[PDB]
Amino acid sequence: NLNKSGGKKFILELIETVYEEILDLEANLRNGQQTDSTAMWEALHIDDSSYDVNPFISMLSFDKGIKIMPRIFNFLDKQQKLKILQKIFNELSHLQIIILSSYKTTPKPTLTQLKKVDLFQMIILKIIVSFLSNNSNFIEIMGLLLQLIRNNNVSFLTTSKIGLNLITILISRAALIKISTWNEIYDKLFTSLESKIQLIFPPREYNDHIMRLQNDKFMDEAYIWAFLASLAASGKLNHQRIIIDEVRDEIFATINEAETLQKKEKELSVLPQRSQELDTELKSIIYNKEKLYQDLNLFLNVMGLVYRDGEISELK
């Protein structure tokens, strides 16, 4: 709720103040003059514990708040940027974009709501990725993972496209930093997901609704298989056994969809007369068939397995 942070008029006023401070910093920098980002940092209210939901978290409910984020990052130092990430992960379940992108809390998102999710995805996640890839050590990444696991119902976060992608970013980054603290923290994360891994795949009624609004012929589930690939890659054999078991029916459903597309391809390609529209149809079928093969193999290859020649077999 917006009232749990001071109300709509208060948050909209904070955003206007943030824009004024950025415009001043940008003008000073452009004119080759000295810059002081203290007033801008203070206008963000990150260290403000006065409200049930932090004012910065509520500012992220508005497109204007989201759109100024890369410009904000141009004038902050490492610890300030880390404090923002810590805040986001600590209050991730209170983030409106998580509630909007979860099939559980928002089973029928409107097109306007889907546009907000795509915006947050494009701007916010690109910033998190770039910052962690460049300015983060082992202790700091481990810190963010613990912030996520301790302050949120992790299974709820995985019902959200944003939630799932944020977890994938943290796992993938942790895996690149090379008994370890990471082995211990991965296992704590694994515990919060065990017996609930299948819940990352949204219901069909949800997929239909999104497909209708976005003009998608197939629901893009590449981000789900990317998450499963990163989860499997950082796991021991026993973790992998559980993951495969929990998503086995999803592996078979994907294979069936790929095999239906392969049959359609065969049936249409053998037709003697082929107009430009039939060539467009065939190119569309081949594209979607290869996409399913590639998304599934991203996950399978990580465990030394491969889907090839209509079967799952051992790689190398």
Binding site: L237, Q240, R241, I244, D245, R248, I251, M303, G304, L305, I312, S313, E314, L315
Partner: peptide
């Protein structure tokens, strides 16, 4: 050998 074990999990009915 790890791959053989996971392949056996896929064979569960």
């Amino acid at each position: 050998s790890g791959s053989n074990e996971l392949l056996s999990i896929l064979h569960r009915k």
